[model samples]
Target: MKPPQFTWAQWFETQHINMTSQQCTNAMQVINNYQRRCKNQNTFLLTTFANVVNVCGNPNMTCPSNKTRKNCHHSGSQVPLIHCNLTTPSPQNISNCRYAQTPANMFYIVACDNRDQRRDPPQYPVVPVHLDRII
Candidate 1:
């Protein structure tokens, strides 16, 4: 089977910088619906995508490759975000999955890849493909 598409637009939809806890839950529903499965946990950044994109430009450090991407970068500073965890007893319907949100400010990691063709000026050649973790 073909893998689920994970474009920047989709990423933004799922993890918009302004999203609230309730919005995050709805985003998770969209994620599960698209992927056809539940995602146990997810982290959302609370800053502009521009700021997040810069983290990959001159990262604090490079990190080991994750499962599907080889270009992982750690941010130079802490950023705010909401950490969402799936409640226990996984629901039968993906939409039934409830998430508990925890707010935090920490250094985060992300997997970056080629720039989106639609980006004007091409200032950022690399954009985040995945939100890896926070420390």
Candidate 2:
């Protein structure tokens, strides 16, 4: 599986998704309008994506660790073998987020944990980490 190369901003254009800042009384209609062909009932690209987080609170918060911050570093699971499915050549082990897919909700987040982090990253407050390639 090749990695997803679309940077955060580029991803929006390529995916045909928009994050509007307007208020709508008909929330359902607003959401429904954003539903395209790829993220239909069958293919939940939005909710069903994977989040790969190794750090938390951006580069500001102290590492989440109550035990002395010595080996503090919560990371994500980046198991290439499983995520990449052993495509011809094996992949490298990601930091904490080795290889995790998205959940099954229209707006689900899956921020994973690291090995030696002070604390675990938030699971349901971020965007999933997707593979660059669609292999």
Candidate 3:
């Protein structure tokens, strides 16, 4: 039995490829060329490239409807009580409408992080130190 001859397109084809083998071959070549040039930042390069070529739509896009009454902090009798109302946005109203979060358990929500960390807001500011950075 003889082995198969080497073809340029054969290198790109797996058991499951939907498009033209030639197109796949060219795409692989372009990708290889790009990757060869990107030594350390190949992660961001490939990640950004993958977004353009193989987009599955917004993964991190938060939806208000998807947030359950529990997640949004309103359930049962609390639904009517909590003022979970949202105002309409014009060009002027955009700031208030953007980045909507649930009705706060206001005091704990305000004090939670800082209170436990033993830092007073105006007087004591907590500056996060990253271990990755050398002083």
Candidate 4:
């Protein structure tokens, strides 16, 4: 058996992405708008729309129409992820669009070694803590 090769392209695919001028200008305009609501709100909201709805992942988890009344995360050829609306609002608006559950990617943070324990010695460049100042 072979281990899968990690794809850097996939990792950095969106690292340097630049939005269109209109997009940028519109964002700047909104950010520079007099209304505080327009400042930095709509731009971030649009980016949220693009990331959560328009772009982000491929072969994404797909929910049914009921589940994705507003937007969907599906991009793959696999079986459709089951989705159901649980709200009474219209499916177009998120406030109105209520979904029960859908297959989705999520992130979680790892906890640090907060437990009381001695730190391990360094594996490389081993040296006394007192000598570290000279290096």
lDDT to native, each model:
0.67, 0.25, 0.20, 0.23
Q: How far is each candidate from the true structure, as Cα RMSD in Å?
A: 3.8, 16.2, 25.3, 21.7
Model 1, span 6-124: residue lDDT tens = 56634643554546445556667766676677788777787777887787776434554456455777888898878878874245778788778888899887777787686423766
Q: Which residue runs does candidate 3 get wrong by more than 4 Å?
A: 1-22, 37-135
List ranges where model 2 is wrong by over 4 Å.
1-18, 26-30, 36-135
Best by lDDT: 1
Lowest lDDT sum, 10 consecutive residues, model 4, at: 126-135
Q: 1-135, model 2: which lDDT tens digit per residue?
A: 111444332342223222222111121122233332112211112211232232232332222333233222222322221111111221232211121222222221222223222222344343322222211
Candidate 3: C-alpha lDDT: 0.20
Candidate number with the higher TM-score (1 or 2): 1
Model 3 CA lDDT for position 127: 17
Error of 4 at 99 (Å): 32
Worst 10 residues of 2 by lDDT: 81-90
Tell me model 1's lDDT, rounded to 2 decimals. Answer: 0.67
Query: How far off is residue 54 in model 1, in Å?
Result: 1.0
Clashing pairs in 3: none
Superposition-based RMSD of candidate 2 using all C-alpha atoms, in angstroms: 16.2
TM-score of each: 0.72, 0.16, 0.15, 0.16
